Amino acid sequence: MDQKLSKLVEELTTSGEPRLNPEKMKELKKICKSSEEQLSRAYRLLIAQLTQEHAEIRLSAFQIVEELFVRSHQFRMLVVSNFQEFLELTLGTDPAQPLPPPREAAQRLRQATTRAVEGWNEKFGEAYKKLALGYHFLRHNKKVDFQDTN
C-alpha cells in the first residue's frame, strides 16, 4: 500500500502535465481516505516533492496539497503545522531560495498558491488564524499584489 502511494505521488508529480490525471488523483484520494497514516505519508511525500528543483513537479505537488487541504481536515492540520516552509517552497518568499525553472511554470505556481492561500483565508481564517497571519505577512509586509496578473 505504501509503495502504491509513493508510486502514485511520483507519477502525479513527474508527469509534467499542466493538470493532474483525474483517475490517479481519485485513487490517491481513496488511499488518503483509507487511513490517516497513509494521509500523513502522502503529506510527507508531497513536502519532499516540493523540495525538488523542478517547477512542474512543485506545481503538481501544490495542486495535490490544495485538493487534500480542501477535502481533508488532518491534511489541513499538517499544512498549518509547516505553513512557513510550504510558503517558502511555493511562493519563493525567501530571496535566497528562488523558484526553480522553468520561469513560466514557477509563475503559474506562484499565481495558484496566491489564489489558494486567499481562498483558504476566506474559508477558514477565523479558525485557522495561523495561516491567516502568514497570509497578511506576505500581503502587506511582503507587498504581494493579489490583483497582479503575475
Q: Which of 22, 53, 73, 140 binds other proteins (CB under 8 A)?
A: 140
Among 107, 108, 116, 137, binds other proteins (CB under 8 A): 137
Q: How far is CA 109 from CA 117, 123, 150, in A?
A: 12, 21, 10
DSSP state of 141: I
Binding mask 64-103 for other proteins (x = CB under 8 A): --------------------x-------------------
Which CB atom, from 1 or from 133, has the smaller least distance to other proteins?
Answer: 133
Site for other proteins contains 141 (CB under 8 A): yes
Cell of 55: 517547477
The DSSP letter of residue 102 is P
Distance, CA of 58 to CA of 52 (rounded, Å): 7
What angle separates helix 129-136 from helix 83-91, to the nearest 10 degrees? 40
| Binds other proteins by CB under 8 A, chosen from 134, 147, 149, 150 | 134
Q: Which three cell numbers stand for residue 125?
A: 481564517
Sign of CA pseudo-dihedral 31, 20, 16, 108:
negative
Nearer of residues 63 and 90 to other proteins, judged by Cβ: 90
Site mask, other proteins, residues 2-41, x = CB under 8 A? ----------------------------------------
Q: Which residues in this chain contact other proteins in the complex, by CB under 8 A?
A: 84, 129-130, 133-134, 136-137, 140-141
